Amino acid sequence: APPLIADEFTLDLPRIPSLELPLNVSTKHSSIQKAIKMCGGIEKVKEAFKEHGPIESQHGLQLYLNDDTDSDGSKSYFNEHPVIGKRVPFRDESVILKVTMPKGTLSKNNNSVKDSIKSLKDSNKLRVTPVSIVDNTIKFREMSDFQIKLDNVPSAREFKSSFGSLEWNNFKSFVNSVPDNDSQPQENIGNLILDRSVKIPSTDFQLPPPPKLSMVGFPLLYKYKANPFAK
Amino acid sequence: KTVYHAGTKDGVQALIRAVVVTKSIKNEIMWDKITKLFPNNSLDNLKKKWTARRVRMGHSGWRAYVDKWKKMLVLAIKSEKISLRDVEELDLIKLLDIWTSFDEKEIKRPLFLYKNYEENRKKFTLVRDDTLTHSGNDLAMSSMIQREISSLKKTYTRKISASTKDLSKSQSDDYIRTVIRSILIESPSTTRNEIEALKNVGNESIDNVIMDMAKEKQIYLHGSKLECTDTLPDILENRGNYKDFGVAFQYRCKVNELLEAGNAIVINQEPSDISSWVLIDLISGELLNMDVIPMVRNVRPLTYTSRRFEIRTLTPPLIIYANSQTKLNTARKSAVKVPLGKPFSRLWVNGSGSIRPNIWKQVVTMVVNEIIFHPGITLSRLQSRCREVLSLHEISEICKWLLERQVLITTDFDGYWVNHNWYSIYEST
Amino acid sequence: YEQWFELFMELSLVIAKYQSVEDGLSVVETAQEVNVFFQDPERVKMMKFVKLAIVLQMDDEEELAENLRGLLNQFQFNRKVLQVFMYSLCRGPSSLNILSSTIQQKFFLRQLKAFDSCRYNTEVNGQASITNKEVYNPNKKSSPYLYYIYAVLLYSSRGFLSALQYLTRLEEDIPDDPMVNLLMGLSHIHRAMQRLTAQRHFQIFHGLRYLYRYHKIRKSLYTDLEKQEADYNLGRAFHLIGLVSIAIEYYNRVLENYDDGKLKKHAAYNSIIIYQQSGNVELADHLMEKYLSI
Amino acid sequence: MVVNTIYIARHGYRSNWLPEGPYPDPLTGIDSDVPLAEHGVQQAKELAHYLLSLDNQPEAAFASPFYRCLETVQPIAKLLEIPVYLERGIGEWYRPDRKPVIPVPAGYEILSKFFPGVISQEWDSTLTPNEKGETEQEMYMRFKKFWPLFIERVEKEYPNVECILLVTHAASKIALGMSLLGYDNPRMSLNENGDKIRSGSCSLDKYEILKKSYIPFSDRKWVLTMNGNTEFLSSGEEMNWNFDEVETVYISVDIPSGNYKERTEIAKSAILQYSGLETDAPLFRIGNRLYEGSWERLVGTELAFPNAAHVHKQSEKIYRIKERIVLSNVRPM
DNA sequence: AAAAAAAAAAAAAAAAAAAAAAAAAAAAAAAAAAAAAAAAAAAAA
DNA sequence: TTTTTTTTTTTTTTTTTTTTTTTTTTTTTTTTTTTTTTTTTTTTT
């Protein structure tokens, strides 16, 4: 009998962006929707695919590793200078195969899609279609920047409990106790601080960091070697 | 009596078909049979053209020709085109016309798949076309456009199954490449048939990996002789780095003895590049605090300048000395017996079973020169970034020997990373 | 009308915690036009501060630079004003441009000129004019709060040698503060890595005096749960200058030595992102689950 | 030109399927002929945004003159910038025992008052189905008679048509498909494993030519290379009907380029087959290129986004493609 | 001998030159096509 | 049976295509030059 022909399927298909989050998300929508909430959410994930241009003029997509909130509804780590991902310029095209198969075949087969298929080998219930093509990708390969913590520096807790929290109740008391006439720009800001509950050392003038303590997010290549270009 | 001049565009394919037919039937290249088809050409012009065609197609081509030939041979016997006597006598004219006639019929089909997988494994034979060679290189990058385009594209996955090559079989394939490399630095040329150590591994796979190493230019081929390419030594001398570390365990001594005096070495001129392989680590080992020679400076009102403003005083020449609190980097290393496999098992090991010590120094320092910039490494991505140099069977015997001599420490899942004073491999005692 | 001012500021701070943050801005910039609030100058100060907080929940360069230039001008020379500017520019690399910009680095030179004018009681060539006149300084020290942010606006913009100028100027006055010694070490190393400099290894080690001075400060004079950032950041430094296995001992200290999870996700990520390049793909996926998955 | 692409889709979700009223009056005044629900108009907009993503846009849409099939195309026609043609040869199926009457819809003159700018009067219908209802034997032969007469008129009236859309009813979707492919009756399975033409509201068929190297209608051959597609709809398969639990995963088919500065691509309107998914290395086709590739799992978790597809004139639907195959290029001989 | 004016140096600022990286053009190698020559086959004496 | 003519096959030459190397342009960094102010020296009264 004429050997049976495999179903031919189109490759003219919807073309699809993709996002390689170094987060090991579960199958559940409950893991996925928060793993997206980390990388600036469902909005900025879409917009970071639209960003054309040469690779160093790309802002890229921000990934925040600590969605953790303190009980005031602040960003518990409002000091987070995020990870940066950028849109791959040389993404090869790739096609996605949806596998439709009996419920609980995953739990029956090592939670492996491969062995889930291999269990139904002789049966009519296995159903595969190519359904879309990925043609574009983002990879998060620019580091998170230096990060301070502002829980033991007193005016830093003043800032978190005021700015970070947006709590009027714990913000009015940062801004009140700001001088109009700064009486003594020479002296430790501690001289204005009511809160001695953290034992801050005398030499700490409680300078905050810049938003980029690193200027270049990929490593600046100080491999230590003698510079042949120093002339 | 189908004859070819080997200069004809079809005659090159006739030469290919005829070696496949002769070796697949009689286990040998029957040149006395093949030369009857090429009267217009010399034995050695035909050998050279054949050798060059097996080099360009490699392992993933040669077996595909043999597998299509044996599948066509099976289909021709089952359709009475071939008697087993035509196989036993090796009548190349009949077997070549039959190959030609089969292609002339398959050329007429738009090449659809069967649903049945064994029908596809019968009625396609398949050439794996090595674009992504799995040589995990991003070649000698320095620019931030080079580095950010590469490192946005590059792959972030793990194989679920064993590879399409059986890993028990691949444990001979990579071990062939390494026994070869480990003899190309030994010798400017080597002969496949006679002098290879591998021969417990099947001679077919030896020859197929020789074709692939010539395709990847790891060897030149002068007939029977593999030939040494200095590209391997050049990549060791460019990516291996051991002179810097050598002067670095020596610059450890030049810093350390002076630290407890308080009044110590003053950094007042460009200190050696190696001095930054040592001071940066030893300061990160919390041995150190840094004092200032108090060079009195003409600070004045109305003045706002930097670039040569009291010149040296914005690198005001430091004294570098013992912090009173701590020392972390003391006596951690030990006489761990060198990683030494079978007589050419791993790039360094020489024929006597001791290290080629310079190749060892260059290669361990090459691997640490990977890992300084590549911590939390598998054996596998280190095999791919070393694919021009080291297999996975080599990289374990470095990476565990560096955990035991504690220059490396390892995370979960056998990721290697170096703990501090890592450059000091070759310490004074 | 302090009751209505409280309601406007609290409502704007509440709106900005959720979607359509622009409605929060409309309340506060209306309040800056309303005489009932804006004729009380402590409330002028408070409104400009509130809207600066709100801006950091949305994300931009230009709106943020405009609100900041709007409140360093008023409330002149002022330590808390200068400090809230420098907390603000943390999240978003959109914020880096506000500091790489020449437009703000000119402002911070003119402020440093103005403080010198009022310190020595002379004119200074191209100063800003004084208006906040109780500024009093009998021991004639600098203002660290100026020195630092003028070094920042030279440090951003890749003026690394020009930034080291004003952090050597702040070293003269407040020797063992944290951010002075971190940013100064940061300037020396970012300077050092330019293509061709004479004294390039020399130019990295001055980075380490001021980084390890900030570390020895943090490790010996602060709570354990905030020594963690002395370990994280010194780790981060070695990663920025591509000495990454020295970054890893310090990232591991964030993972092993401390309870508070926050910096473990950064130390883990900046481990994962190495561990991808290094390719312990198993370990990376594992750490990713252990710290980053949900 | 010769038509290479035929799309057939069933109409949207019927208003008279809703659990509570008021059920709307049929706008034509004819028995049955009900309008869609807003949920049906949503499945129509989804279907439109799927076709809009394909470089193979329709040239035109042939609509069943029944009201709900035109209310299905009113967003499609206005989004792909195409004309709609009435074709009684793709109307509803009713049996001769159906009561109280057999519905046959009003002309262009009534439909154009509800669907202005959508419908063109340029086309005269290929045939009309039996006003006294049709047996299964009549119905199947009416569609077998339609196809050659229909396509012969399309390629004379509209000789620029290489791609066409038909929007119709459940029996009208399956019976057209089975007769185009050349099966003896509409109850036959497409294959020995028992598959059939899937036919929920807004489910999409595509029928594509075997390719050579004008042509008469009788020498042609086809494959249903997109069976009853609902993977672009929000709610998936709904109110399916056929002539007589499950779980979902995704595998990426990666095709990597060797040089990191060079990008490799999938040809417009090309075809794929897969075989041996169960094996340690499956086999694949893409256009005329062949392949084999290792089974792989990511570090981290690619998300790939159907709801963020490009345009080429609830939980948001997203794929977590943690598992993959990496196709080495593996050509035939 | 004292005072005033002019010139030179220094610190600073701004512009130009120098150095490296990227892109484009030219050169070299390889493949394909065309032309010429030789051999074989067919036809005519 | 021999000679001449036509056709086919083989070999050589020419052209096109691909790969490699060099040159040019752009960008970033470093050094030098220019300009302004202060100090020192010389000249004149």
Of A183, A203, A217, the CB nearest to C176: A203
Tell me how crowded residue B197 is: count the other CB atoms within 10 A of its CB. Answer: 16
Residue with the two structure tokens 């291999």 = A118
Interatomic CA distance for residues D23 and D44, integer angstroms = 20
Protein-contacted bases of chain E (C-beta within 7 A)? 11-13, 18-22, 32
Residue C276: closest C-alpha in chain D? D299
Helix or strand run (H / E) with residue D312: none
Of C165, C206, C242, the CB nearest to B318: C206
With beta carbons less than 8 A apart as the criterion, state whether D77 and D118 touch: yes
Residue with the two structure tokens 């020498």 = D219
* Residue B318: strand pairing partners: B267, B292
Q: Which of residues 172-231 of C touch strand E (CB under 7 A)?
A: 195-196
d(CA C153, nearest CA chain A) in Å: 9
| D156 three-state secondary structure | helix
Burial class (CB within 10 angstroms; exposed 0-12, middle 13-18, buried 19+) of D258: middle
Q: Which among B103, B123, B143 is the end of a domain?
A: B123
Burial class (CB within 10 angstroms; exposed 0-12, middle 13-18, buried 19+) of A57: exposed
Evaluate whether residue B13 is within a structural domain: yes
The answer to whether the C-beta of B145 is closer than 7 A to strand E is yes
Interatomic CA distance for residues D92 and D70, integer angstroms = 13
Region for B413 from its dihedrals, namely left if φ exceeds 0, alpha if ψ lies in -120 to 50, beta otherwise: left
| Rg from Cα positions in chain A | 27
Best mutation target, C153, C193, C283, to test chain B (most B CBs within 10 A): C283
Evaluate whether residue B137 is within a structural domain: no
| B191 three-state secondary structure | strand
> Is B185 in the same domain as B250?
no
Q: Which of residues 202-231 of A touch strand E (CB under 7 A)?
A: 228-229, 231
> Is B314 in the same domain as B336?
no
**CA C55 to each of CA A75, C19, C50, C71, D16: distance values in angstroms, whole numbers, following the listed order:** 15, 13, 9, 14, 51
With beta carbons less than 8 A apart as the criterion, state whether A87 and A137 touch: yes
Q: D14: which 2 tokens?
A: 């019927």
> Is B25 in the same domain as B116?
yes
Residue B311 (CA) to nucleotide E8 (C1'), in angstroms, measures 22
For residue A182, the chain C residues in CB contact (below 8 A) are: 75-81, 132, 135
For residue C241, the chain A residues in CB contact (below 8 A) are: 219-220, 222
Helix or strand run (H / E) with residue B282: helix B273-284
Helix or strand run (H / E) with residue B366: helix B357-371
* Residue A133: strand pairing partners: A15, A95
DSSP characters over B222-256: ETTEEEE-THHHHHHHHH--HHHHHHHHHHHHHHH
Interatomic CA distance for residues B275 and B247, integer angstroms = 8
Beta strand D163-168 with D61-63 is parallel
With beta carbons less than 8 A apart as the criterion, state whether C171 and C142 touch: no
Preceding amide of D22 cis, omega within 30? yes
**CA D242 to each of CA D88, D196, D199: distance values in angstroms, whole numbers, following the listed order:** 22, 8, 7
Residue B298 (CA) to nucleotide E1 (C1'), in angstroms, measures 35
Tell me B284's DSSP state: H
DSSP characters over D241-288: -----EEEEEEEEE---SSTT------TT-EEEEE-TTSSS-EEEETT
Q: A33: which 2 tokens?
A: 């929707």
Centroid of chain to Cα D332: 32
Of A14, A124, A137, the CB nearest to D232: A14
Determine whether the interchain pair A139/B151 forms a contact, defined as Cβ–Cβ distance below 8 Å: yes
Interatomic CA distance for residues A227 and D194, integer angstroms = 71
With beta carbons less than 8 A apart as the criterion, state whether A10 and D4 touch: no
For residue D329, the chain B residues in CB contact (below 8 A) are: 128-129, 131
d(CA A213, nearest CA chain C) in Å: 7
Of D249, D316, D318, the CB nearest to A113: D249
Written as one letter, the residue type at C153 is L
Residue B302 (CA) to nucleotide F45 (C1'), in angstroms, measures 38
Interatomic CA distance for residues D12 and D93, integer angstroms = 17
Our count of domains for chain B comes to: 4
Centroid of chain to Cα A9: 36
Written as one letter, the residue type at C1 is Y
Q: C89: which 2 tokens?
A: 């520019």
Interatomic CA distance for residues A66 and A81, integer angstroms = 10
Interatomic CA distance for residues D20 and C187, integer angstroms = 71
Interatomic CA distance for residues D8 and D58, integer angstroms = 11
With beta carbons less than 8 A apart as the criterion, state whether C281 and B378 touch: yes
**CA C166 to each of CA A95, A190, C6, C150: distance values in angstroms, whole numbers, following the listed order:** 56, 22, 39, 7
D28, D34, D37, D43 alpha-carbon torsion, rounded to 10°: -100
Q: C244: which 2 tokens?
A: 């990454």
Written as one letter, the residue type at D33 is D
**CA C190 to each of CA A213, A217, C160, C194: distance values in angstroms, whole numbers, following the listed order:** 10, 12, 6, 8
For residue C95, the chain A residues in CB contact (below 8 A) are: 211-212
Tell me how crowded residue D238 is: count the other CB atoms within 10 A of its CB. Answer: 18
Instruction: Please identify among residues 296-315 of chain D the ones whose CB lies closer than 8 Å to any CB of chain C.
Output: 298-300
Residue with the two structure tokens 């600066």 = C52
Q: How many helices and strands, by DSSP H and E, does chain B display?
A: 16, 10
> Is B262 in the same domain as B357?
no
Evaluate whether residue B425 is within a structural domain: no
Residue C292: closest C-alpha in chain D? D300
| D90 three-state secondary structure | helix
A42 interfaces chain D, CB cutoff of 8 Å: yes
Interatomic CA distance for residues D141 and D151, integer angstroms = 16
Of A22, A183, A211, the CB nearest to C288: A22
**CA B98 to each of CA B122, B146, D189: distance values in angstroms, whole numbers, following the listed order:** 18, 52, 40
Domain span at residue B267?
242-301+309-322
Beta strand A83-87 with D204-209 is unpaired
SS3 content of chain A, % helix, strand, coil (to 5): 25, 20, 60
With beta carbons less than 8 A apart as the criterion, state whether B333 and B424 touch: yes
Which residues, other chains included, contact D99 with Cβ-Cβ below 8 Å and sequence gap of 6+? none
Evaluate whether residue B44 is within a structural domain: yes
> Is B317 in the same domain as B256?
yes
Residue C281: closest C-alpha in chain D? D299
**Chains near D (3 or more Cβ pairs under 8 Å):** A, B, C
Which residues, other chains included, contact B287 with Cβ-Cβ below 8 Å and sequence gap of 6+? B256, B259, B322, B323, B326, B327, B328, B329
Residue with the two structure tokens 């088919």 = D253
Determine whether the interchain pair B112/D285 forms a contact, defined as Cβ–Cβ distance below 8 Å: yes
**Chains near C (3 or more Cβ pairs under 8 Å):** A, B, D
Residue D266: closest C-alpha in chain A? A93
Determine whether the interchain pair A139/B113 forms a contact, defined as Cβ–Cβ distance below 8 Å: no
Residue D299: closest C-alpha in chain C? C285
B260-264 contacts at long range (C-beta below 8 A, 24 or more positions apart):
B260/B321, B260/B322, B261/B321, B262/B291, B262/B319, B262/B321, B262/B322, B263/B319, B263/B321, B264/B319, B264/B320, B264/B321
A65 interfaces chain D, CB cutoff of 8 Å: no
- Residue B310: nearest nucleotide (C-alpha to C1'): E11
Centroid of chain to Cα C88: 7
Which residues, other chains included, contact D135 with Cβ-Cβ below 8 Å and sequence gap of 6+? D95, D96
For residue D255, the chain A residues in CB contact (below 8 A) are: 92-94
Of B111, B126, B156, the CB nearest to D330: B126
Q: Which among B104, B123, B142 is the end of a domain?
A: B123
Interatomic CA distance for residues C164 and C148, integer angstroms = 10
Helix or strand run (H / E) with residue D304: strand D289-304
Determine whether the interchain pair D298/C276 forms a contact, defined as Cβ–Cβ distance below 8 Å: no
> Is B222 in the same domain as B191?
yes
Q: Which among B229, B256, B274 is the end of a domain?
A: B229
With beta carbons less than 8 A apart as the criterion, state whether B151 and A218 touch: yes
Instruction: Please identify among residues 85-114 of chain A the ones whose CB lies closer than 8 Å to any CB of chain C.
Output: none
Nearest to A220 by CA among C231, C243, C234: C243
> Is B14 in the same domain as B114?
yes
Evaluate whether residue B129 is within a structural domain: no
Protein-contacted bases of chain F (C-beta within 7 A)? 10-12, 28-32
Q: Would you say how long chain A is, in residues?
A: 231
A116 interfaces chain D, CB cutoff of 8 Å: yes
With beta carbons less than 8 A apart as the criterion, state whether A147 and C233 touch: yes
Determine whether the interchain pair B113/D273 forms a contact, defined as Cβ–Cβ distance below 8 Å: yes
Determine whether the interchain pair A55/B149 forms a contact, defined as Cβ–Cβ distance below 8 Å: yes
Q: In what order do the strands lie in the sheet with B266-267?
A: B266-267, B318-322, B288-292
Nearest to D49 by CA among D78, D9, D76: D76
For residue C119, the chain B residues in CB contact (below 8 A) are: 301
Task: Look up the CATH number of the domain holding residue B386.
Answer: 1.10.10
Going from N- to C-terminal start, the domains of chain A cover 1-94+134-146, 148-210
Best mutation target, C239, C245, C257, C283, to test chain B (most B CBs within 10 A): C245
